Amino acid sequence: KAQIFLEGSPAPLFFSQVRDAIAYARGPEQIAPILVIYVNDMGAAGATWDQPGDGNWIAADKAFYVVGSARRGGMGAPEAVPFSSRDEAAAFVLAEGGQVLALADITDAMVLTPVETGSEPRADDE
Numbered sequence: 432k433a434q435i436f437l438e439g440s441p442a443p444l445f446f447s448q449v450r451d452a453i454a455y456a457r458g459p460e461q462i463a464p465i466l467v468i469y470v471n472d473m474g475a476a477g478a479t480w481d482q483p484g485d486g487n488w489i490a491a492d493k494a495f496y497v498v499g500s501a502r503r504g505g506m507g508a509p510e511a512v513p514f515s516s517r518d519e520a521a522a523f524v525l526a527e528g529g530q531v532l533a534l535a536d537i538t539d540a541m542v543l544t545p546v547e548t549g550s551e552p553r554a555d556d557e
Contacts, residue, residue: 432471432482433491437463448480449473450510453491457542468492468534476503476510477523489515492534496520498541500529509542530557 433452434445440463446452449470456465472487476499491513497520503509513534514520520531530541530552538553 432473433468433475434470435460435468436466438466439463443469447482449475449482449491449513451480453511453513454508457537465492470494470513472514474512475514476512487515489513494534495531496534496537497523497528497531499523499527501527503527503529505544505547511542532557 432445432447433449434443435452435456436443437460444452444455453468453470453475456468468491470489470491471485472489473482473485475482477483495514495517496511497514498509498511512520512523512528514523517531520528524531532538532541532553536553540550541552544550
């Protein structure tokens, strides 16, 4: 489950699909800025919008994000698995994930590429 609370908006955007709702936070939020996003850690992008099972309750905005390089919409529809435990997100990367970065460190360059051609991460800094 995922929900984003927008600044200026009296109502948060909430859905079961984490990957979907978090996508809205990364684009369709042009209506009102994302103040903070809360997510019910349930696989999110590891699974489908149906999700495996109940896990952690966390604020994705203040948590770890892994953007999948091996399996995800790098040039398409990228999904993010937000997790409270970094090491879990890193394990996801070992399997398929690309980079583990906090939502406070989310760059458009890592979530989506023009092509790839050996592109730089958050700022070629990490």
